[PDB]
From a paper:
Here, we study fold transition between distinct β-barrels by protein engineering and structural biology technique. Here, we discover that the previously reconstructed ancient DPBB sequence could also adopt a β-barrel fold named Double-Zeta β-barrel (DZBB), as a metamorphic protein. The DZBB fold is not found in any modern protein, although its structure shares similarities with RIFT and OB. Furthermore, the reconstructed OB fold could also be converted to the four-stranded SH3 fold by a simple circular permutation. Thus, these ancient β-barrel folds (DPBB, RIFT, OB, and SH3) could be readily interconverted by a few feasible mutations through the missing-link fold, DZBB, indicating their significantly close evolutionary relationships.
The most simplified DPBB protein we designed previously, design-1 (mk2h_ΔMILPYS), did not fold in the typical buffer conditions (50 mM phosphate, 150 mM NaCl), but crystallized under two different conditions, containing malonate or malic acid ions, and adopted the DPBB fold in the crystals. Here, we report its third type of crystal, formed under different conditions (100 mM Tris, pH8.5, 20% PEG-400, 200 mM lithium sulfate). Interestingly, we could not solve its structure by molecular replacement using the DPBB fold as a model, implying that design-1 had adopted a different conformation in the third type of crystal. By molecular replacement with the predicted design-2 model (RIFT fold) and subsequent manual remodeling, the crystal structures of design-1 (third type of crystal) and design-2 were determined. Surprisingly, they both adopted into a unique β-barrel fold that topologically differs from DPBB and RIFT. Compared to the homo-dimeric DPBB fold, the directions of the β2- and β2’-strands were inverted, resulting in all anti-parallel strand patterns like those in RIFT. However, the 1st loop connecting β1– β2 was rolled up, unlike the simple β-turn in RIFT. As this loop configuration resembles the letter “Zeta” in the topological scheme, we named this β-barrel fold the Double-Zeta β-barrel (DZBB). Therefore, design-1 can fold into two different structures with an identical sequence. Design-1 exhibited the metamorphic property, adapting two different folds, DPBB and DZBB.
Residue numbers in the entry:
A (entry chain A), B (entry chain A): 5 to 48
The structure:
Amino acid sequence: GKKVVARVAEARAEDVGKRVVRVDKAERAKVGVKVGDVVEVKKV
Amino acid sequence: GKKVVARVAEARAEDVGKRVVRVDKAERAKVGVKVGDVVEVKKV
Protein backbone atom coordinates (compact mmCIF):
# COMPACT_ATOMS: atom_id res chain seq x y z
CA GLY A 1 0.00 0.00 0.00
CA LYS A 2 1.20 3.52 -0.80
CA LYS A 3 1.75 6.10 1.94
CA VAL A 4 2.35 9.87 2.18
CA VAL A 5 5.29 11.39 4.10
CA ALA A 6 4.08 14.68 5.56
CA ARG A 7 4.65 17.17 8.34
CA VAL A 8 2.29 18.34 11.07
CA ALA A 9 1.42 21.93 10.20
CA GLU A 10 -0.65 24.81 11.52
CA ALA A 11 -3.63 25.31 9.22
CA ARG A 12 -3.53 28.64 7.38
CA ALA A 13 -6.39 30.88 6.31
CA GLU A 14 -5.61 29.87 2.71
CA ASP A 15 -6.03 26.20 3.72
CA VAL A 16 -9.80 26.58 4.18
CA GLY A 17 -11.60 24.26 1.79
CA LYS A 18 -8.47 22.12 1.29
CA ARG A 19 -8.16 18.48 2.30
CA VAL A 20 -6.52 17.88 5.68
CA VAL A 21 -6.27 15.35 8.46
CA ARG A 22 -6.97 17.05 11.79
CA VAL A 23 -4.71 15.97 14.67
CA ASP A 24 -5.89 17.48 18.02
CA LYS A 25 -3.84 17.87 21.23
CA ALA A 26 -4.86 14.49 22.61
CA GLU A 27 -4.10 12.76 19.32
CA ARG A 28 -0.75 14.52 19.13
CA ALA A 29 0.10 13.34 22.65
CA LYS A 30 -0.81 9.76 21.70
CA VAL A 31 1.39 9.80 18.50
CA GLY A 32 4.06 11.89 20.28
CA VAL A 33 4.19 14.72 17.72
CA LYS A 34 4.40 18.51 17.76
CA VAL A 35 3.89 20.96 14.91
CA GLY A 36 6.81 20.50 12.51
CA ASP A 37 7.21 16.75 13.07
CA VAL A 38 7.27 14.22 10.25
CA VAL A 39 4.42 11.71 10.10
CA GLU A 40 3.31 8.98 7.64
CA VAL A 41 -0.28 8.92 6.34
CA LYS A 42 -1.51 5.55 5.17
CA LYS A 43 -4.78 4.50 3.61
CA VAL A 44 -6.86 2.04 5.60
CA GLY B 1 4.63 2.86 18.04
CA LYS B 2 1.25 4.52 18.57
CA LYS B 3 -0.87 5.69 15.65
CA VAL B 4 -3.97 7.86 15.10
CA VAL B 5 -7.04 6.66 13.17
CA ALA B 6 -8.50 9.68 11.39
CA ARG B 7 -10.56 10.77 8.42
CA VAL B 8 -9.65 13.04 5.52
CA ALA B 9 -11.63 16.23 6.05
CA GLU B 10 -12.20 19.59 4.42
CA ALA B 11 -10.55 22.26 6.55
CA ARG B 12 -13.06 24.67 8.10
CA ALA B 13 -12.70 28.36 8.87
CA GLU B 14 -12.65 27.40 12.57
CA ASP B 15 -9.70 25.07 11.87
CA VAL B 16 -7.32 27.98 11.24
CA GLY B 17 -4.49 27.86 13.75
CA LYS B 18 -5.17 24.18 14.55
CA ARG B 19 -2.75 21.34 13.87
CA VAL B 20 -3.36 19.46 10.61
CA VAL B 21 -1.62 17.28 8.07
CA ARG B 22 -2.22 18.68 4.58
CA VAL B 23 -2.93 16.07 1.89
CA ASP B 24 -3.06 17.67 -1.62
CA LYS B 25 -4.66 16.20 -4.78
CA ALA B 26 -1.48 14.47 -5.89
CA GLU B 27 -0.91 13.00 -2.44
CA ARG B 28 -4.51 11.85 -2.29
CA ALA B 29 -4.14 10.13 -5.66
CA LYS B 30 -0.98 8.37 -4.43
CA VAL B 31 -2.66 7.10 -1.18
CA GLY B 32 -5.96 6.50 -3.03
CA VAL B 33 -8.16 8.59 -0.71
CA LYS B 34 -11.01 11.07 -1.08
CA VAL B 35 -12.50 13.38 1.54
CA GLY B 36 -14.31 11.19 4.07
CA ASP B 37 -11.89 8.25 3.85
CA VAL B 38 -10.23 6.69 6.87
CA VAL B 39 -6.44 6.99 7.13
CA GLU B 40 -3.82 6.09 9.78
CA VAL B 41 -1.31 8.72 10.94
CA LYS B 42 1.92 7.36 12.36
CA LYS B 43 4.90 9.09 13.89
CA VAL B 44 8.18 8.69 12.04
